[PDB]
RNA sequence: AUUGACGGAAGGGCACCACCAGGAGUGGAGCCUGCGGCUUAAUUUGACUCAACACGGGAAACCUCACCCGGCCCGGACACGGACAGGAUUGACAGAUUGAUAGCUCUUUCUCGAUUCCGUGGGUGGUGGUGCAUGGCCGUUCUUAGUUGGUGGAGCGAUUUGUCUGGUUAAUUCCGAUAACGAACGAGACUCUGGCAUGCUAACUAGUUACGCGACCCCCGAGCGGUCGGCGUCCCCCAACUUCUUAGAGGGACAAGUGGCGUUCAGCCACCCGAGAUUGAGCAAUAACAGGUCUGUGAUGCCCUUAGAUGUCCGGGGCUGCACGCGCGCUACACUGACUGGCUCAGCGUGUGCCUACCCUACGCCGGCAGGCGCGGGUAACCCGUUGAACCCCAUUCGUGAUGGGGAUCGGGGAUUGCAAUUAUUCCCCAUGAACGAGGAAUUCCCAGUAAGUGCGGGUCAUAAGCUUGCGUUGAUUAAGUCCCUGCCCUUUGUACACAC
């Protein structure tokens, strides 16, 4: 199916909004960060959340995605 | 001095492994040659019954099962020292069986 | 009175809960009816893992 | 029912000595496990306790093909006057507490 | 010694002993708030720990009833005399115990009380005792001579998966009445609490909990302290 | 403040036995036996102040469980 | 006017309990087994489309047993009254009698010693009735995606928005549009299991590798030669180690990386690296159904019966009866085979029992076989056991013939279990040798270690599997789609329906 559910997406979004300064586009370092900063009860949910976090950080670079509010708004002086 | 063998049996892995850890740590603190935990093959006892009390339905079955885990510890020490290695807060679902080099 | 031999068969064995002679489970030394087993399984220690 | 007086005296003596009486619902067991030395059938234990329960001298419980009987405070006085016991002898359960 | 038995038969026999002892105590100490039994093996004695709400009636009159229970347990299960001691202990919180609450609802129904006020009272007590959710289902001949089932829910109640084995405790009981038998199902969802006896330790497996970031005042110009 | 709440006490239990029970941990200051009004026995509660907040903090983990007079007693702050 | 249900309405979606492409079939034959009918003393009975019919764990010789024939027993508490140590009343050897060595009944008299007997009330027991009085459990709708509050918007409400045009997904799974926003149950997550680790923790109840001893083979004189499930290094070094085995902790996979499509969104397709890019199950919502079970229960209401008993025990019979009609299956119709011999490989898992009698078996000796007699191991990673399984593989015979295919039916004999084998329990040997030449109309189940072939354990079990439940072994054809058929779900639409035409 490969369709991530609401728990994965909502958790990923809150993780990004609170810890944007510590996530790159690297699934393994993201996985380690999300296992340090969150309390995820399993390892499959940890991996799915880190995967969606990686996929979203690969979209933050190409414009503000609808749903995430971060400090990146300030640097848009234009 | 004998070849004392402690056999620990349980239905859950957590308490069994923690009792094994306590015994090994207590025995290592008092300088014993401890041949550590040997793990025998877990026995799975399986009973498959019909779900229904009557004899009507879609013929579905119920698969109950119970695992039994077994651990061994080999000490080479006098009896009175193993009498204080053991007797330290054995968990409920664990059962020990000392064999003092003879039946 | 109780003259007939009852050393084997369904007559010899009965459930240890209800004394019913049908559906008896003798495996591992239970001697329990299938329904009584299905009721007391969790108390005995038979979890339903799969 | 009809049982020898020795059997009834033995059953009552054991019941008053402990204060409890356990039996198995099996009318064909030839000897009761606790009274085997006096050779009483299980049926006599079951029916003597039935005759005691209907008069209100024992409380009865039943679980998993086994009867349990406790000796009430009327049964104590009854069996004390029946067995001709001096009123100092006490059942094991009642009044044998320990500080 | 002469008695030796395979580990399979031994574990099944131990489970059967615990099941029969629990059934006997459930029938015997029903109106005393009996919740559970725990058999603890010690080198000198065998301790049967009875969990009850009203442990003073379990103890009896100056210890009489606990002595009678000890005597029947010894005489039925064939323990050596003096090797089995029965202790009673009070359950910590009564609201988070489905067996105690099912028995409470049972005895409230045995006395003359209406089924709806009794279920609402039990449900309100369970919810006020810290439960995340509760469900009480009473089925039987409630209104007339055509049976129906009335359920009363308040709060969260999970049903499926593995968490329903440690976050939910259920209890089924019967109530013999003049016109029939009533069935009482009570199930309570315990609250999460780390390092506590109120409920489970491990959280629900789909409850991510992000730790709040510390306030991070940023630096302006590099500085270093030579301590 | 040396607060000890003994629970699950027996009817036989009086001030003296609680005294002799907590005496191997030291000296006492104030026993409080929650007796029944107009009826001479306990209601299942005892409030103990041990004149020092440290040895009571040792005895809470000591006299826990213990099965006194066929009643397992739960002690708490 | 609203909510449900229905329409021999109109649009979308989904499913090998639906189809398409196919595989194996079933339906045809013989037999095993369940149901109906018929017969009978009785042939106990529940259930009838899926959701009845190898189902009641239901493979019934006795028991089970509920049915039929016949005969004992009270295991009729307790209360009241009567009779009673001048005996209330229990047992009983002999003859008859009986199926009986039931003192059941009769003659005969002994014995027992307040426990009983007899009337009235009241118990108790019941695989008796009612599952359309019920509890629990189970099945089904439906394992499909469905269900419901809080606040806010819309109305006198009932109701309704959320819960949606569309895209996507296994999924009311998400993304988007947007009077909704934020949530809950179900789905997912979760638990068990399968696949990976020469990394960690360890092991004479698992082994490997070295070393030593021994047997055998070549050889010229041969060898850091080859074979060894032969022995030993467990007397503590006089060897180390964990690859294989076991099982703990962690790690590991996330559509993560690269292209392409897509509203550059959720996602989909392909590929690299990888053990693995969809392992298989368990659990499983709100509402229901006069679904099944009173024959699982010391779960249970009411009714029936209760001593010439529908309690209970014993003896015998029956469930199995046989012109016939169905359902689940097993064996086959042969040469891609049968027969004879030879050679080589498994994985689950069980094993001496409270009452309870009944375990798995190595090795030796008799017998042609089933079997018998000795003797030892095992309460089990210790013994059976390196579980020498079958199909398969290698050679021989046969030769397209109802044949050396098939093994029904039937005759004779020998053993085992049991207290008892006839209406054949099961097993073995010789003999007989039927239909059946690939099965009409219809119809089932299924997509990867899957179908199918092939054996082995468990349950039942004193005796026993053509059943079921698991396990490995050899191992594919076809497909990566659709709404045509059969059903479900949603939306619009009509209603004189709300116990749903
Ligand atoms: Mg959920
Ligand atoms: Mg799930
Ligand atoms: Mg087709
Ligand atoms: Mg076939
Ligand atoms: Mg056929
Ligand atoms: Mg269906
Ligand atoms: Mg048979
Ligand atoms: Mg016969
Ligand atoms: Mg019969
Ligand atoms: Mg007679
Ligand atoms: Mg005679
Ligand atoms: Mg009954
Ligand atoms: Mg029904
Ligand atoms: Mg029902
Ligand atoms: Mg509103
Ligand atoms: Mg019906
Ligand atoms: Mg029932
Ligand atoms: Mg009979
Ligand atoms: Mg039949
Ligand atoms: Mg069928
Ligand atoms: Mg042939
Ligand atoms: Mg022929
Ligand atoms: Mg078998
Ligand atoms: Mg069968
Ligand atoms: Mg079809």
DSSP three-state, residue B42: strand
Which stretch of DSSP H or E encloses residue C38? helix C34-44
Strand nucleotide closest to residue A65 (CA to C1'): G265
Interatomic CA distance for residues E88 and F73, integer angstroms: 9
Distances (CA, A) of E194 to B58, B67, E198, E199, E201: 43, 28, 9, 8, 5
For residue B52, the CA-to-ligand 14 centroid distance in Å is 12
What angle is formed at CA F53 by the lines to CA F56 and CA F20, rounded to 5 degrees?
A: 35
Structure tokens at E219: 């630096």
Query: E-strand spans in D1-99?
Result: 20-24, 58-62, 66-71
Query: Tokens 């990686």 belong to which residue?
Result: A54
User: Helices A27-37 & A44-60, crossing angle to 10 degrees?
Assistant: 120
Structure tokens at F77: 């702050």
CB A4 within 8 A of CB A50: no
DSSP three-state, residue E142: coil
The 3-state secondary structure of D39-58, one letter per residue: CCCHHHHHHHHHHHHCCCCE
Burial of residue E160, with CB atoms counted within 10 A of its CB: 0-12 exposed, 13-18 middle, 19 or more buried: exposed
Contacts of E3 (CB under 8 A, 6+ apart): none
CB B44 within 8 A of CB B66: yes
For residue E19, the CA-to-ligand 11 centroid distance in Å is 52
In chain E, positions 152-211, which contact chain A (CB-CB < 8 Å)?
Answer: 202-211
Distances (CA, A) of F14 to A23, D54, D94, D98, E91: 66, 41, 22, 16, 23
Closest CB from E8, E40, E43 relative to B43: E8
Counting DSSP H helices and E strands in chain B, the numbers are: 2, 4
DSSP three-state, residue E14: helix
C17 at D interface, C-beta within 8 A: yes
CB E171 within 8 A of CB E102: yes
Question: Measured between beta carbons, which residues in chain A are less than 8 angstroms from residue E167?
Answer: none
CA distance from start to end of chain E: 72
Q: Which residues pair with B4 in a beta bridge?
A: B75, B100
For residue E5, the CA-to-ligand 23 centroid distance in Å is 24
The Cβ of residue B61 has, within 10 Å, a number of other Cβ atoms equal to: 9
A72 at E interface, C-beta within 8 A: no
Interatomic CA distance for residues E88 and E63, integer angstroms: 11
DSSP three-state, residue F42: strand
Which stretch of DSSP H or E encloses residue E70? helix E64-77
Domain carrying residue C21: 1-50
Q: Domains of chain A (ranges plus CATH)?
A: 1-61 (1.10.60.20)
CB F31 within 8 A of CB F21: no
The Cβ of residue A12 has, within 10 Å, a number of other Cβ atoms equal to: 25
Which ligand neighbours the alpha carbon of D2 most closely?
10
CB D15 within 8 A of CB D78: no
State the pairing for strand pair E148-155/E168-176.
unpaired
Chain C 4-33 residues in 7 Å CB range of strand G:
4-18, 20-29, 31, 33
Q: Is C33 annotated as a binding-site member?
A: yes
Name the nearest CA neighbour of D58 among D84, D41, D76. D76
Interatomic CA distance for residues F9 and E196, integer angstroms: 24
Distances (CA, A) of D28 to C3, C8, F50: 11, 16, 63
CB D83 within 8 A of CB D13: yes
Query: E-strand spans in E96-160?
Result: 133-140, 148-155
Structure tokens at A37: 């900063």
Domain ranges of chain D: 1-99
Secondary structure percentages of chain F, helix, strand, coil, to 5? 20, 40, 40
Contacts of B102 (CB under 8 A, 6+ apart): none
Interatomic CA distance for residues E176 and B18, integer angstroms: 47
Burial of residue B82, with CB atoms counted within 10 A of its CB: 0-12 exposed, 13-18 middle, 19 or more buried: buried
CB E215 within 8 A of CB A20: no
CB F72 within 8 A of CB E49: yes
CA E156 to C1' G288, whole Å: 23
CB E201 within 8 A of CB E195: yes
Name the nearest CA neighbour of E55 among E6, E82, E92, E18. E92
**Within a 13 Å sphere around the CA of E171, how many CA atoms are in the beta-carbon half?**
22
Which stretch of DSSP H or E encloses residue B79? helix B79-85
E87 at F interface, C-beta within 8 A: yes
DSSP, residue by residue, F44-72:
EEEEEE-SSTTHHHHHTTTSSEEEETTEE
The Cβ of residue F11 has, within 10 Å, a number of other Cβ atoms equal to: 18
CA distance from start to end of chain F: 9
Structure tokens at E172: 């089924």
Residue E154 main-chain phi, psi, to 5 deg: -155, 115
CB E210 within 8 A of CB A14: yes
The Cβ of residue A26 has, within 10 Å, a number of other Cβ atoms equal to: 13
Is there contact between A10 and strand G, defined as CB under 7 Å from any strand atom?
yes
CA A47 to C1' G189, whole Å: 12
CB F3 within 8 A of CB F72: no
CA C22 to C1' G54, whole Å: 18
DSSP, residue by residue, E79-92:
PPTT-EEEEEEE-S
Q: Is C15 annotated as a binding-site member?
A: yes
Structure tokens at E173: 């009981």
Interatomic CA distance for residues D19 and D37, integer angstroms: 19
**Within a 13 Å sphere around the CA of A64, how many CA atoms are in the beta-carbon half?**
12
């Amino acid at each position: 199916g490969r369709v991530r559910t609401k728990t994965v997406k909502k958790a990923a979004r809150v993780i990004i909004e609170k810890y944007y300064t510590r996530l790159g586009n690297d699934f393994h370092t993201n996985k380690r960060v999300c296992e340090e900063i969150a309390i995820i009860p399993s390892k499959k949910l940890r991996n799915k959340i880190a995967g969606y976090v990686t996929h979203l950080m690969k979209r933050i670079q190409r414009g503000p995605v609808r749903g995430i509010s971060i400090k990146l708004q300030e640097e848009e002086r234009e | 001095i004998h070849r004392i063998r402690i056999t620990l049996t349980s239905r859950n892995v957590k308490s069994l492994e923690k009792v094994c850890a306590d015994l090994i740590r207590g025995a290592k603190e008092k300088n014993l040659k401890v041949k550590g935990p040997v793990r025998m093959p877990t026995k799975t006892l399986r009973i498959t019954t019909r779900k229904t009390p009557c004899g009507e339905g879609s013929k579905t079955w119920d698969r109950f099962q119970m695992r039994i885990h077994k651990r061994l510890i080999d000490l080479h020490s006098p009896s009175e020292i193993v009498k204080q290695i053991t007797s330290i807060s054995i968990e409920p679902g664990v059962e020990v069986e000392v064999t003092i080099a003879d039946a | 009175y109780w003259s007939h031999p009852r050393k084997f068969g369904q007559g010899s064995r009965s459930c240890r809960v209800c004394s019913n002679r049908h559906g008896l489970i003798r495996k591992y030394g239970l001697n329990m009816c299938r329904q009584c087993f299905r009721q007391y399984a969790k108390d005995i220690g038979f979890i339903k893992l799969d | 029912m009809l049982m020898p007086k020795k059997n009834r005296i033995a059953i009552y003596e054991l019941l008053f000595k402990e204060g409890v009486m356990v039996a198995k619902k099996d009318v064909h067991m030839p000897k009761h496990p606790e009274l085997a030395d006096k050779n009483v059938p299980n049926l006599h234990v079951m029916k003597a306790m039935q005759s005691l329960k209907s008069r209100g001298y024992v409380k009865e419980q039943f679980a998993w093909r086994h009867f349990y009987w406790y000796l009430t405070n009327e049964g104590i006085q009854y069996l004390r006057d029946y067995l001709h016991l001096p009123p100092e002898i006490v059942p094991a359960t009642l009044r044998r507490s320990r500080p | 010694m002469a008695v030796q038995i395979s580990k399979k038969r031994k574990f099944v026999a131990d489970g059967i002993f615990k099941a029969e002892l629990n059934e006997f105590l459930t029938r015997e100490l029903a109106e005393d708030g009996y919740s559970g039994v725990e058999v603890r093996v010690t080198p000198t004695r065998t301790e049967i720990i009875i969990l009850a709400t009203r442990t003073q009636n379990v103890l009896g009159e100056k210890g009489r009833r606990i002595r009678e229970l000890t005597a029947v347990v010894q005489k039925r299960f064939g323990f050596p005399e003096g090797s089995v001691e029965l202790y009673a202990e009070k359950v910590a919180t009564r609201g988070l115990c489905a067996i105690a609450q099912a028995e409470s609802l049972r005895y409230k129904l045995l006395g003359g009380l209406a089924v709806r006020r009794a279920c609402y009272g039990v449900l309100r007590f369970i919810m006020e005792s810290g439960a995340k959710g509760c469900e009480v289902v009473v089925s039987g001949k409630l209104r007339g001579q055509r049976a129906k089932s009335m359920k009363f829910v308040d709060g969260l109640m999970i049903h499926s998966g593995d968490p329903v084995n440690y976050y939910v405790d259920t209890a089924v009981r019967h109530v013999l009445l003049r016109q029939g038998v009533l069935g009482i199902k009570v199930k309570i969802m315990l609250p999460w609490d780390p390092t506590g006896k109120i409920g489970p330790k491990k959280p629900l497996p789909d409850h991510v909990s992000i730790v709040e970031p510390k306030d991070e005042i940023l630096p302006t110009t590099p500085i270093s302290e030579q301590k | 403040n040396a607060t000890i709440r003994v629970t699950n006490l027996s009817e036989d239990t009086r001030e003296t036995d609680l005294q002799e029970l907590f005496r191997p941990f030291g000296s006492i200051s104030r026993i409080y036996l929650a007796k029944d009004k107009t009826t001479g026995q306990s209601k299942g509660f005892a409030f103990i102040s041990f004149h020092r907040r440290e040895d009571a903090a040792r005895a809470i983990a000591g006299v826990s469980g213990f099965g006194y007079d066929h009643l397992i007693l739960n002690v708490e702050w």
